[PDB]
């Protein structure tokens, strides 16, 4: 059984960044051959050149898929910080794998504004590597509890993107698939 890497990249819909989708690939040969012959603008890697992976047997391969802005792609690299790196998708400094990204302006955007994608903008503390919270509880900035009412000094954390086809590249939606390598003997 070759690996289901086709159905990860060609999925109709990708998850939002505050609630990214973790797929587990195992018990299957993996033709990373396509991984190096696509025209996926960022096939960046951190420690494992794509050439040796087809000679390595990995116990588990995890594919984390989500949609972010073009100017947020750099926050997916290890060692980076920012609103995405710290509050949505935290990747460890000791990262083994590759980050693949491509423009999806014709897929994930509409004229009226695509608001189906939402990221976290406020949180009490920064995230640890590979963890995520999907809590929508009201964030209090001030000295007085609002008990769920978003009044002054209380905010709804999960803000939303509004992707539109005419935005500049940095504000266009990008589909990101992070392949983390921890049963999967590549040919």
């Amino acid at each position, epitope marked *: *059984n070759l690996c289901p890497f086709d159905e990860v990249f060609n999925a109709t*819909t990708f998850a939002s960044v505050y609630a990214w989708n973790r797929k587990r690939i195992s018990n299957c040969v993996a033709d990373y051959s396509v991984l190096y012959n696509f025209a996926f603008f960022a096939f960046k890697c951190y420690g494992v050149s794509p050439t040796k992976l087809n000679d390595l047997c990995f116990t588990n391969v995890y594919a984390d898929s989500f949609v972010i802005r073009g100017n947020e792609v750099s926050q997916i690299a290890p060692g980076q910080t920012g609103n995405i790196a710290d509050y949505n998708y935290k990747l460890p400094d000791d990262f083994t794998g590759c980050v693949i990204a491509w423009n999806s302006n014709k*897929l994930d955007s509409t004229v009226g504004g695509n608001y189906n994608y939402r990221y976290r903008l406020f949180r009490k503390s920064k995230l640890k590597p590979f963890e995520r919270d999907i809590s929508t509880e009201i964030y209090q900035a001030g000295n007085k509890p609002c008990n769920g009412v978003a009044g002054v000094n209380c905010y709804f954390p999960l803000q939303s993107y509004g992707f539109r086809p005419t935005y500049g590249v940095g504000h266009q939606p990008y589909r990101v698939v992070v392949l983390s390598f921890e049963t999967v003997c590549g040919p």
Partner: antibody
């Protein structure tokens, strides 16, 4: 990549028909199998989809109960078995290889029906 | 969702442009729509997928586009071999085909 279906059959009302489909030229367990149907003078009518890996099946709304789908990996052959044939069940049942749903995760894909067989005519 | 195609019989002279439409009763994903072409006496083939992406092996005279509830297919120059029956499909919800049109 080819799909080869069985020959035509004639059945009486109330009988069941089992239509086979032979697939070759590609990794069997990487793609699902779908069964659209076209009756004389009509357009196409989806009957259902079956995974070749997990065995999961997704049926069209008005075929649930009669249609039954199965695959055999060792001989890379699919099967479809409609049941309680009615007079309206006369048509040509096509075997198709799909790229509309993932075979392993069951998630919807961007694609269509890549390869169609010659069509099996069932008379009733 | 219910798909309706028009005109039912877009039979025009070869060498000219032929445009088909497919309307949806509900908004559908632009990546979940496809077009098929069925020649007389045989099985249909995938022509376009993902609304606009051309299927492999298909001539570049075929082009698709659309969004929302209004999708179209255009042939830049109709050939003698293009006088076939075309169908639109969506698989955003379940899977359904349109009525089909004859060119």
């Amino acid at each position: 990549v080819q799909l080869v279906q069985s020959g035509a059959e004639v059945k009486k009302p109330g009988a069941s028909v089992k239509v086979s489909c032979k697939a070759s030229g590609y990794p069997f367990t990487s793609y699902g199998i779908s069964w659209v149907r076209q009756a004389p003078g009509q357009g196409l009518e989806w009957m259902g989809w079956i995974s070749t890996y997990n065995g999961n099946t997704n049926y069209a709304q008005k075929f649930q109960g009669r249609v039954t789908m199965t695959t055999d990996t060792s001989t890379t052959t699919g099967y479809m078995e409609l049941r309680r044939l009615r007079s309206d069940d006369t048509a040509v049942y096509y075997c198709a290889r799909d790229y509309t749903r993932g075979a392993w995760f069951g998630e919807s894909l961007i694609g269509g029906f890549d390869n169609w067989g010659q069509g099996t005519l069932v008379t009733v | 969702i219910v798909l309706t195609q028009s005109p039912g019989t877009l039979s025009l002279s070869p060498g000219e442009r032929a445009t088909l439409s497919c309307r949806a009763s509900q908004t559908v994903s632009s990546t979940s729509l496809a077009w098929y072409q069925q020649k007389p006496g045989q099985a249909p083939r995938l022509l376009i997928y993902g609304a606009s992406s051309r299927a492999t092996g298909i001539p570049d005279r075929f082009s698709g586009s659309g969004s929302g509830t209004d999708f179209t297919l255009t042939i830049s120059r109709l050939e003698p071999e293009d006088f076939a029956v075309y169908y639109c499909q969506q698989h955003d919800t379940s899977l359904t085909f349109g009525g089909g049109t004859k060119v």
